[PDB]
Write a protein that binds this DNA or RNA. Structure first.
Ligand SMILES: Nc1ncnc2c1ncn2[C@@H]1O[C@H](COP(=O)(O)OP(=O)(O)O)[C@@H](O)[C@H]1O
Lengths: 97, 442, 96, 109, 85, 96, 80, 109, 96
DNA sequence: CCCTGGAGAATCCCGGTGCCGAGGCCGCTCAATTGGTCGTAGACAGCTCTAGCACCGCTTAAACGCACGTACGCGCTGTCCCCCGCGTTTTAACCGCCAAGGGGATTACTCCCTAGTCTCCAGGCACGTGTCAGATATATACATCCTGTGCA
DNA sequence: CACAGGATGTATATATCTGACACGTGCCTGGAGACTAGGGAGTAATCCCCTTGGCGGTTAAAACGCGGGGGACAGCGCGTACGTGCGTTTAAGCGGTGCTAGAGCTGTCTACGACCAATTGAGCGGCCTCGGCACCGGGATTCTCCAGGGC
């Protein structure tokens, strides 16, 4: 009885919404904690400027977006609609990573 | 006005209350802004209610008024408003976006009220709405929130258009003279617009005498035996010494050396690796690895076979966790009132510790939790495991058990570690406390 | 008075007013434009330096800049930039 | 006497700092000697590239009902143009976003 | 001895966040095993970039990592970033 | 008579050509192709033999790598036959 | 001058594919491979001719070819 | 008088030309000044990389029952090593061939 | 009258006789090794020059060479190369 | 039934040719050796503002958890045609050799261009400061899905 | 199978507000003007080498055709895991204390290491020459694939 959308309308709606914007999709404090955790292994007693973490987040988001676009291309090549770790691995292998 | 007017309901004002009302009325007649430092528990809210009732009744132009209170006191102030002086109408702004919009567009914007009660967060959110209405009187309760200039609340509260202003705070002086200058700048910006015996002390007294009124809680009750204090110097455990030397000389990140020395003089187990291995037992390791813990292990059972009802104040949740482990090991009843304790869990804990026939013994409290409440009269001994820079925080912590409802002697035991940063902290705190005394107690 | 930092912001603003008279630009966009100019300058200068070293010469000249522009820019942009640079060099040589 | 000072940018009819470009070339360790016309050529090329990208970004802002240019407009201008996209293929623009692009198999049908 | 661990930081990159990134990438349906692979590849990318940035910072004899060090590391990787330097 | 199944000769050729290191394109046709392509950029261009050999080496290496990626795409599509769709997908992911 | 791209013959393309490691080849792939080869050669020869013209020579050298390949990101070892 | 000449390569115990590396650094337009230790360090690094590659290539050649090293041996050595492959991941070796591998799905059932 | 060309051929041959005493090398392999040495030299030198520019210094030092090696070479290669270079520098400072 | 026979390809061992790598010489140019200078970088003070540590109160958007149904991924079948293996015929590559000339590579010379200096001064940069464009909120109006209900 | 209508999301105006962009101002430091000195490169001339054009014979390689099996592609069915919406929980974000030092930035002073110059002797590049490794052919083996007891 209650209103409900078909399985895939909200997905395309979100696709359009997030392709219309420019904001950051990851959470700033968790990303900062991850960056500090990674840098601790390389060197201890390291301090980060606020701009460094922002640049890291921008670069990481751009890399992930491009990876997902290539992954979607692979999934469509495989006559599918869902993306898979197979697609991610194929994209990385062809790009040379 | 030597006697309280007839508009007050549900009781008549006291002598100190009516003299404070007269002081406030003289302040307004002179057109000055002032600070009521009558200390917590001496009817500041009742005096302000009486002043507002006077302005509404005896003077025929009661305009828009605003009262700023902590969110923990909004209900109490609204209750006092409704009980004492029902002839005046008051409204409160609290809730999410939809509640706020409904309230403003139904009651506030039409403009039929006379007193608006809001908290700090709602003032910051609704500064646009509260900025429109011309303000006749601005009451700020617990005024030591706006001590720091260039803070957002201070800027916003100085941006309003207020004809008359008033501050209510028990502790006008906290650390320096800059906060007192900020409060006096909010009161009268023209008079105090600079960097605030004969050359000192007395000059400050003469300056602050017209603009201040403080009554120590001694001329009203003539009861509640005075504070008793004992200071205990304690040496550290051997691993505490080893870690102290390690931190002093310079793998673990030890950035704030003073921040490490603090807890290192409390308990080394807070550091990573100072604990024993996989078994993680809780048997006598805690006691022997902290001298303060040794002294507390001596003190607590003796108070228990004596008056018991002890309060332990500490400045770290990790220290509170270690103390909880120790109390579980010793099979003591413990209550942890901390910053993370949900509000409903605090009230029943306080009531149960204050139950007429209780069994609770240890009550662990973070020194800055709650605030301006918590009446633990049944408690006897107050143990300050640490001590912070402000002596005011320690004073309020020690008087949380030293309240009007207390009938027996209360003693405050203060632990300190020799040849460490605790000496510096306590001596600074004493310097600030003596500044407070020599500038205020007169 | 902090240290002086040099940027192409004023020249970018002049070109912007030349192209679109009534338009503006933000701090982030200006920073991006400064970075773009720096990166392009670096690429062109490096390619000209490598050309001079390959041909065993010690001077970077307008010929080297033109060849680097052709090597780095993609086609229509390359030809338009070559025309603009040649025109500017002709104007400079004719003037002084 | 001493003649009036005219900028080399004024001589070449440019809106870019020919003198600063010459100084950067000489301080950048690109070669031991720098020609006279090389900074003029380089300044003209930089000016032309800036003009192209700014024209495209201003067009984007005008069709976006906005007077000021933002990194989103810069990204929209850099993409949708083949030559600029080829030039800046490996460049990430902060707060630029992505072009709207939905594959035809994902469209409802 | 009374301590606890909240969560590993690689789990702070949440499932809805990865979904939003995929939505911007242009993806309709996502398998449930995608999130672990995404976390792994993000960790690899961050480790490489941070190693280069820390190398630059150590060379400059500084204890603070700066945006210029990050952009130099990215340019070394071949991922030039405009907007911070 | 004797006839091999369709695919054993292919595997034999795969093994032998992966073991060998010679060039797989005819040199005179490659040289003619190079000269014809160079006719659009300049006239009367003369070529060293080493230049043509280097061009052939680079072209063969590029095509071999492209075919590896194309085979991977075809296997991802659960096939064994490589297709122009596979080549285009490989080029698109490489960034060409 | 024509028919020389068609001189890049089907057996040669098959040999290249076999060295790549493919088993079955569709019939439409030969034209695609020829087009890809033309694009690659066009780019490389364009850069090499630019280097030659800057050198003010008429002969294209292995050094010019190597420099072009290196500047396109395809460094070649074995010719200088 | 003057002492007999002693090469800096002899002083540092290297088989690569410290003086030639110093001259190449001076003439290569890298910096205005060059220190004394930089040529020695760079010669040591180049010698180490050459020795590693040559050792791998010689092992590969002896696996071929040959005495001389060829480009095929160099390619085998480079592509069979992870770190050398990463270092030379965008390089083409002339007359090198490719690593022999067949995808498992193409093998007969 | 062929002008003198330089190469690392004799030094590569010395290293080869040090590591494999009775193994020879051909001319094509020698050319490949010479090209490899030149490429590595150029990479490290360019990285060190960029480091000097970033830090606003005028001289290239062993510190810059070490940082460039850490940047370019991956992992164990970088560790072993740093060890070898440090040893060579210490020997040069002690011997001189 | 699988396991065996036949046939083709691949492998290993031997003997004769060719040429290319390794060694030995000449000379000339580049690197080592001394000596002298200066400017770059190290070392050191003084200042200042950001960054880190352990908490507290409060708000609210976002994340987590959960149940349901539905497209969708995956497997299995069948068809047919397209691709592969093999024989035959033809075409052009490959090799060897020869002939001619364009052009790359070298050298000598001169001049003209650029580096370096000193004086001068104006364009560019930091600092204040104020007004407008863009963000936000909120009520409308429009376009978009989705399902039911006659059509069966 | 084709519309009606309901519900929802999204575009559209309009009003308010704020903080960043654009502009003016003073100062200073780096670019321009005028000048001189020296060496890099443009220009001409010469040599020889190495590219191009052609011819003839060889044989391997390509093109064409043919026949048949296996792989691609469409179709169907199933049962499963992911989208969707709702209710509950958590921590991200903001605003505060509270000290200290800490780390980076600028100005000054001073020594030592790198440039530069002249001089000279071995190290290294080019040129010959020669023999052993690779190559090429030949002939005797072992492996593997295909057809059949449906051998
Ligand atoms: N009308 C009154 N007369 C005397 N004492 C009072 C009165 N009202 C409150 N108090 C005392 O004040 C204490 C609480 O102080 P506070 O909350 O400041 O009061 P208020 O809210 O009235 O200002 C109580 O313990 C109570 O004893």
């Amino acid at each position: 009885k209650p209103h409900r959308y078909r399985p895939g309308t909200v997905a395309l709606r979100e696709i359009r919404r997030y392709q219309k914007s420019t904001e950051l999709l990851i959470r700033k404090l968790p990303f900062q904690r991850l960056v500090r955790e990674i840098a601790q292994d390389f060197k201890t007693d390291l301090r980060f400027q606020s701009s460094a973490v922002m640049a890291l987040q921008e670069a990481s988001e751009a890399y992930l977006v491009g990876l997902f676009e290539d992954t979607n291309l692979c999934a469509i090549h495989a006559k599918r609609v869902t993306i898979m770790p197979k697609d991610i691995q194929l994209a990385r292998r062809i790009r040379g990573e | 006005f030597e006697d309280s007017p007839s508009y007050v309901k549900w009781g008549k004002l006291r002598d100190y209350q009516v003299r404070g009302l007269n002081w406030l009325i003289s302040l307004y007649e002179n057109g000055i802004n002032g600070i009521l430092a009558d200390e917590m528990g001496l009817g500041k809210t009742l005096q302000t209610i009486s002043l507002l009732g006077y302005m509404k009744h005896y003077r025929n132009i009661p305009g828009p008024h605003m009262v700023l209170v902590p969110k923990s006191t909004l209900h109490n102030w609204m209750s006092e408003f409704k009980r004492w002086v029902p002839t005046l109408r008051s409204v409160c702004l609290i809730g999410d976006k939809e509640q706020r919009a409904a309230f403003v567009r139904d009651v506030l914007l039409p403009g039929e009220w006379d007193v608006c009660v809001t908290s700090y967060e709602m003032l910051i959110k609704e500064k646009s709405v509260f900025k429109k209405f011309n303000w006749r009187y601005l009451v700020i309760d617990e005024a030591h929130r706006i001590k720091n200039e260039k803070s957002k609340l201070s800027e916003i509260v100085r941006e309003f258009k207020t004809t008359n202003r008033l501050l209510l705070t028990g502790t006008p002086l906290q650390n320096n003279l800059h906060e007192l200058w900020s409060l006096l700048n909010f009161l009268l910006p023209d008079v105090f617009n600079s960097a605030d015996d004969q050359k000192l002390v007395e000059r400050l007294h003469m300056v602050l005498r017209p603009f201040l009124l403080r009554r120590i809680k001694a001329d009203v009750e003539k009861s509640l035996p005075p504070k008793k204090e004992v200071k205990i110097y304690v040496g550290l455990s051997k691993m505490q010494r080893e870690w102290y030397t390690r931190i002093l000389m310079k793998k673990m990140r030890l950035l704030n050396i003073l921040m490490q020395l603090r807890k290192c003089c409390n308990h080394p187990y807070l550091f990573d690796g100072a604990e024993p291995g996989p078994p993680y037992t809780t048997d006598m390791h805690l006691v022997t690895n902290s001298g303060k813990m040794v002294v507390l292990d001596k003190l607590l059972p003796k108070l228990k076979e004596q008056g018991s009802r002890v309060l332990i104040f500490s400045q770290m949740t990790r220290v509170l966790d270690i103390l909880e482990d120790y109390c579980m090991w010793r099979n003591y009843e413990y209550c942890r009132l901390d910053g993370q304790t949900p509000h409903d869990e605090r009230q029943d804990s306080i009531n149960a510790y204050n139950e007429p026939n209780s069994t609770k013994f240890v009550f662990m409290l973070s020194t800055r939790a709650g605030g301006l409440g918590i009446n633990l009269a049944t408690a006897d001994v107050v143990i300050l495991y640490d001590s912070d820079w402000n002596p005011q925080v320690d004073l309020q912590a020690m008087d949380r058990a030293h309240r009007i409802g207390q009938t027996k002697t209360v003693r405050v035991f203060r632990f300190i570690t020799d040849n460490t940063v605790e000496e510096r902290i306590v001596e600074r705190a004493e310097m600030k406390l003596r500044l407070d005394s020599i500038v205020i107690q007169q | 008075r902090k240290t002086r930092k040099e940027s192409y912001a004023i020249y970018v603003y002049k070109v912007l007013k030349q192209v679109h008279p009534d338009t503006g630009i933000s701090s982030k966009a200006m920073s991006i434009m400064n970075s773009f100019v720096n990166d392009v300058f670096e690429r062109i200068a490096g390619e000209a330096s490598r050309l001079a070293h390959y041909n065993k010469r010690s001077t970077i000249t307008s010929r080297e800049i033109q060849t680097a522009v052709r090597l780095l820019l993609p086609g229509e942009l390359a030809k338009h930039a070559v025309s603009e640079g040649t025109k500017a060099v002709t104007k400079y040589t004719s003037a002084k | 006497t001493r003649a009036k000072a005219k900028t080399r940018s004024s001589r070449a009819g440019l809106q870019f700092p020919v003198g600063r470009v010459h100084r950067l070339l000489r301080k950048g360790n690109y070669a031991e000697r720098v020609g006279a016309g090389a900074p003029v050529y380089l300044a003209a090329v930089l000016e032309y590239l800036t003009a192209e990208i700014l024209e495209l970004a201003g067009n984007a802002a005008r069709d976006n009902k906005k007077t000021r240019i933002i990194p989103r407009h810069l990204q929209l201008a850099v993409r949708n143009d083949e030559e600029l996209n080829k030039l800046l293929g490996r460049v990430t623009i902060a707060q630029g976003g992505v072009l709207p692009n939905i594959q035809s198999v994902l469209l409802p049908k | 001895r009374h301590r606890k661990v909240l969560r590993d930081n690689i789990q702070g990159i949440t499932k809805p966040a990865i979904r939003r990134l995929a939505r911007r990438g242009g993806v309709k349906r996502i398998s449930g095993l995608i999130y672990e692979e995404t976390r792994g590849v993000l960790k690899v990318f961050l480790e490489n970039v941070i190693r280069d940035a820390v190398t630059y910072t150590e060379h400059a004899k500084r204890k603070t990592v700066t945006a210029m060090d990050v952009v130099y590391a990215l340019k070394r990787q071949g991922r030039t970033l405009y907007g911070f330097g």
